[PDB]
Amino acid sequence: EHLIAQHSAIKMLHSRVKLILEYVKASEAGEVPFNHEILREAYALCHCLPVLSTDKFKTDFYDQCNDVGLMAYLGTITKTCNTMNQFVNKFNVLYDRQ
């Protein structure tokens, strides 16, 4: 229910840059205007490829995911500890007088 907003906006601009793609392909194909400002931007794009190779964000994202993952680790804690407390309850229920 979140990523479908992603999907919707991406599909909208997808229609945009796909109409772009279509009249583009026609440029090199034929009967549609020959301009030098078509792909050229595509070259800019292919040098816009994966931003920050940098190892900077590489460490940064080690940071991020380690944070959330140890969060989840603690939550391996939360889940099984709640399970454990209920177990000790029922152990104090039938094995014992809670």
Which residues bind to other proteins, rule: CB under 8 A? Answer: 1-15, 17, 21, 24-25, 27-29, 34, 36, 38-40, 42-43, 45-53, 57-59, 61-69, 71-76, 78-87, 90, 93-94
Q: Which is nearer to other proteins, 31 or 94 (CB)?
A: 94
CB of 65 to other proteins, least distance (A): 6
Rounded CA separation 61/52 (Å): 11
Two tokens, residue 98: 């809670």
CB of 5 to other proteins, least distance (A): 5
Rounded CA separation 21/15 (Å): 9
Q: What is the DSSP string of 65-94?
A: HHHHHHHHHHHHHHHHHHHHHHHHHHHHHT
CB of 44 to other proteins, least distance (A): 11
Two tokens, residue 82: 């709640």
